[PDB]
Amino acid sequence: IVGGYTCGANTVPYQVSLNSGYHFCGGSLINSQWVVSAAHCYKSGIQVRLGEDNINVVEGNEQFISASKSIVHPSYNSNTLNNDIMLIKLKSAASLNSRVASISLPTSCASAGTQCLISGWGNTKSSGTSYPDVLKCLKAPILSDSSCKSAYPGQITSNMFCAGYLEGGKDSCQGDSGGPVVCSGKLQGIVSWGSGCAQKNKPGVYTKVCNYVSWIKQTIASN
Ligand SMILES: NCCc1c[nH]c2ccc(O)cc12
Ligand SMILES: [Ca+2]
């Protein structure tokens, strides 16, 4: 997260770190046994880390739970990043508490101008590299479909939205992938892609979770 703030320990209780020997993606806990992330975060050998603030120190609220199954959206296209969503089932249920909590799926799609919270452990610089150890947060609005299409001509599908700032300086970045965009206490987006980080006229692009609620619910019901 570029141009964000330090969230504060366990203030984003649905935020997960996907770990394969090191943090490589974020995700969101949507019930005690399931995580939502980006399809571009897919790999085998995932450990889900819940209750994290500093990902390099054991602070005492963590739960580390292996993935039993990963389900990439059936229509994910790695070239276009259309349908950039995946579900991860945990081997055992998380213990839910004030610091490890699920985020609700949306019943409706959020409108342009809605303020959201984006979070992650990704890079904090728009040029060069500095990876924070503690969770970073950014408040950002959802942009109009027309401003998003104007920023990324020919690349925005009905399964994507833009959020952030056309002036630059504030955005999700590398390592924030798969993490949550939460608006009015609902999961509306997943950190998906963009042209670099925090560049002028190049806001972040997010998977539009409201389009996937039936797939999520039917997949969880049967797996
Ligand atoms: N808006 C940040 C999007 C993002 C997701 N993953 C990324 C990887 C590299 C990068 O430059 C950017 C990204
Ligand atoms: Ca920790």
CSV table of N, CA, C and O and ligand atoms in Angstrom, one decimal, residues 52 54-55 57-59 62, ligand 2:
chain,number,residue,atom,x,y,z
A,52,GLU,N,-2.8,-11.7,12.0
A,52,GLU,CA,-1.4,-11.0,11.8
A,52,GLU,C,-1.5,-9.5,11.9
A,52,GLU,O,-2.4,-8.9,11.4
A,54,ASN,N,2.3,-7.7,12.5
A,54,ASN,CA,3.7,-7.9,12.0
A,54,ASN,C,3.8,-9.3,11.5
A,54,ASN,O,3.8,-10.3,12.3
A,55,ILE,N,4.1,-9.5,10.2
A,55,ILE,CA,4.2,-10.9,9.6
A,55,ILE,C,5.5,-11.5,9.9
A,55,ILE,O,5.7,-12.7,9.5
A,57,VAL,N,7.0,-11.3,13.1
A,57,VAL,CA,7.1,-11.6,14.5
A,57,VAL,C,5.8,-12.3,15.0
A,57,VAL,O,4.7,-11.8,14.6
A,58,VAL,N,6.0,-13.2,15.9
A,58,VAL,CA,4.8,-13.9,16.5
A,58,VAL,C,4.4,-13.0,17.7
A,58,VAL,O,5.2,-12.8,18.6
A,59,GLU,N,3.2,-12.4,17.6
A,59,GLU,CA,2.8,-11.4,18.6
A,59,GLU,C,1.7,-12.0,19.5
A,59,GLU,O,1.5,-11.4,20.5
A,62,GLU,N,-2.0,-14.9,16.4
A,62,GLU,CA,-2.0,-15.5,15.1
A,62,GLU,C,-2.7,-16.9,15.1
A,62,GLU,O,-2.6,-17.6,16.1
B,2,CA,CA,2.8,-12.0,13.5
